[PDB]
Design a protein that fits this description.
This is part of a larger assembly, with 1 copy of chain A (301 residues) and 2 copies of chain B. Chain A has 301 residues and is mainly beta. Chain A has strands at residues 6-8, 26-28, 41-45, 51-52, 56-60, 93-98, 100-105, 116-118, 134-140, 144-149, 153-155, 169-171, 188-193, 201-206, 208-211, 234-241, 247-248, 257-258, 260-267, 281-289, 292-300. In chain A, the strands form 7 sheets. Chain A has a 4-stranded antiparallel β-sheet with strand order 15-6-5-17, with no helix packed on it. Chain B is an alpha+beta fold and 126 residues long. Chain B has helices spanning 17-35, 66-71; strands at 48-50, 58-59, 77-83, 86-88, 93-95, 98-105, 113-115, 118-122. Chain B has a 3-stranded antiparallel β-sheet with strand order 1-4-5, with no helix packed on it. Chain B has a 3-stranded antiparallel β-sheet with strand order 2-3-6, with no helix packed on it. The longest helix of chain B has 19 residues, at 17-35. Chain B is elongated and about 65 Å long. The chains are: A mainly beta (301), B alpha+beta (126). Chains in contact: A-B, B-C. Chain B binds chain C through residues 18-19, 22-23, 25-26, 30-31, 33-35, 37-39, 41-43, 45, 47-48, 50, 75, 77, 80, 84-86, 88, 95, 97, 99-105, 110, 112-113, 115-116, 118-125, and chain C through 1-7, 10-11, 13-14, 17-18, 21-22, 25-26, 28-29, 34-38, 40-41, 43, 45-47, 50-51, 54-55, 59-63. Chain A: This is DNA-directed RNA polymerase subunit beta''. Chain A: DNA-dependent RNA polymerase catalyzes the transcription of DNA into RNA using the four ribonucleoside triphosphates as substrates. Chain A: Belongs to the RNA polymerase beta' chain family. RpoC2 subfamily.
């Protein structure tokens, strides 16, 4: 009861014995006395499908964005910057392109200048090395410095290129009378980087696709009562996105950044002028027989 | 509960058993049968919940003394402590602690209550 | 006798207490504070209820 959270591990089947993937236990918000309740923040599971430990910028495809959620006043909790699902959008697809970021000390030794093209294994500091090859740019912060370099092929338009107009945008693969373009089977992000006041470069970077499935809501997870009592608990499944459109994730050392996490929502449906349903009290009830036991949350109002 | 049953059947009983037995019966059973009637009140937002565990109540030894209760015009009473937490449906938490509901006056050896430095007695009704 | 009168007074005090906690829980959300359970219950109802009982009820008389 040290923390108000419990991890229920889901056992894996015997069909996977080559990948040692960690089973993301269902994380539930449990009370100190283990007596939780419905109509509150239910259990959540961090899906490993869209979890990456490399810093990446994600952009969602253009769609209908009608925010059906008014602004909620911020409630400070000991100045703890927890992860809040500020973008609960039914996004069909998005493109995330990785990048390499180094947050070196302000007084640390830097060997690479800003906006300098460096290859792999470029020692930017005394004990800091590289992982890819790109044009790394360095910016000085209040107490540190940041070096950023996203893997991309460099190019310069020469009297025949039509890619100058598209800047910092991801374009899907196009096959329309391409008599000179080959191996363009994947979407590429074109960025117009200002190398100099009179010379600019174009960076074509690989992009990784990420889609979302259809959420199934259990609106009939209870039996029809014979006492004509309305069930005030409705359980639904949804997805929570860490970053919004065109947002770059910051990754700490040995830290896996998650893009989408499964969430469970408990809501209510109360009639008018019949009964003002306020809340209910729940606990865990058990019953065992025939070498099998039943485990479910018993919620009575 | 029952004391020696042959009281009033073999000797003249003490002229206090009415008030004394009434107060003891109250302390023993009325507290339980009234705390259970306390509801499970809460908010309409499905966000908070209040609970009062019933089989945890107890009283505390009075702070002041009867002589000092009548000396400073105070009220001889004992504090009622019931263990019960508060449930928040925001992180699904329940903070459990023992609270002080209030103060209840106590009878002395005379069968009376000392309220505001005044001896008071309760008259039976038919 | 004293038992039934005290039981009724305690019932009235508990009703007053639950009304007070209802008001507090109405005011415990709009102020965005996480209070300990003791902050939701004050010893106003029981004390004042018993003082009013022993001061106004015609069945409680000075010795």
């Amino acid at each position: 009861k040290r923390r108000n959270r419990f991890i229920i591990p889901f056992q894996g089947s015997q069909e996977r014995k080559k990948e040692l993937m960690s089973l993301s236990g269902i994380s539930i918000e449990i009370p100190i006395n283990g007596i939780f309740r419905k109509n509150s923040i239910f259990a959540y599971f961090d899906d490993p499908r869209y979890r990456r430990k490399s810093s990446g910028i994600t952009k969602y495809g253009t769609i209908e964005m009608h925010s059906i959620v008014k602004k909620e006043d911020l409630i400070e909790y000991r100045g703890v910057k927890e992860f809040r699902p500020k973008y609960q959008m039914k996004v069909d697809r998005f493109f995330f392109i990785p990048e390499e970021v180094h947050i070196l000390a302000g007084s640390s030794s830097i060997m690479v200048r800003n906006n300098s093209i460096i290859g792999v294994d470029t020692w930017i500091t005394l004990n800091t090395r590289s992982r890819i090859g790109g044009v790394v740019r360095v910016e000085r912060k209040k107490k540190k410095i940041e070096l950023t370099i996203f893997s991309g092929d460099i190019h310069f338009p020469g009297e025949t290129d039509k890619i100058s107009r598209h800047s910092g945008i991801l374009i899907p693969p196009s096959r329309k009378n391409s008599k000179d373009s080959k191996n363009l089977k994947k979407w590429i992000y074109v960025q117009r980087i200002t190398p100099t006041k009179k010379k600019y470069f174009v960076l074509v970077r690989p992009v990784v696709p990420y889609e979302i499935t259809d959420g199934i809501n259990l609106a009939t997870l209870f039996p029809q009562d014979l006492l004509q009592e309305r069930d005030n608990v409705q359980l639904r499944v949804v997805n929570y996105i860490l970053y919004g459109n065109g947002k770059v994730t910051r990754g700490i050392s040995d830290t896996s950044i998650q893009l989408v996490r499964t969430c469970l929502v408990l809501n209510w449906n109360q009639d008018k002028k019949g009964s003002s349903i306020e809340e209910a009290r729940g606990s865990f009830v058990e019953v065992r027989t025939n070498g099998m036991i039943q485990d479910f949350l018993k919620v009575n109002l | 509960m029952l004391r020696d049953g042959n009281e009033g059947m073999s000797t003249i009983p003490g002229f206090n058993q009415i008030q004394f037995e009434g107060f003891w019966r109250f302390i023993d059973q009325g507290l339980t049968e009234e705390l259970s009637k306390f509801p499970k009140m809460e908010d309409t937002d499905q966000e908070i919940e209040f609970q009062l565990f019933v089989e945890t109540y107890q009283l505390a030894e009075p702070l002041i003394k009867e002589k000092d209760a009548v000396y400073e015009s105070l009220t001889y009473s004992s504090e009622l402590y019931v263990s019960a937490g508060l449930i928040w449906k925001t992180r699904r938490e329940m903070q459990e602690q023992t609270i002080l509901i209030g103060n209840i006056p106590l009878m002395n050896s005379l069968g009376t209550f000392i309220v505001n430095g005044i001896y008071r007695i309760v008259i039976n009704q038919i | 006798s004293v038992a039934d009168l005290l039981q009724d007074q305690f019932g009235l005090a508990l009703v007053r207490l639950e009304n007070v906690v209802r008001g507090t829980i109405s005011g415990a959300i709009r102020h965005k504070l996480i209070p300990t359970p003791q902050n939701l219950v004050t010893s106003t109802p029981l004390t004042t209820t018993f003082e009013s009982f022993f001061g106004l009820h015609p069945l409680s008389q000075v010795l």
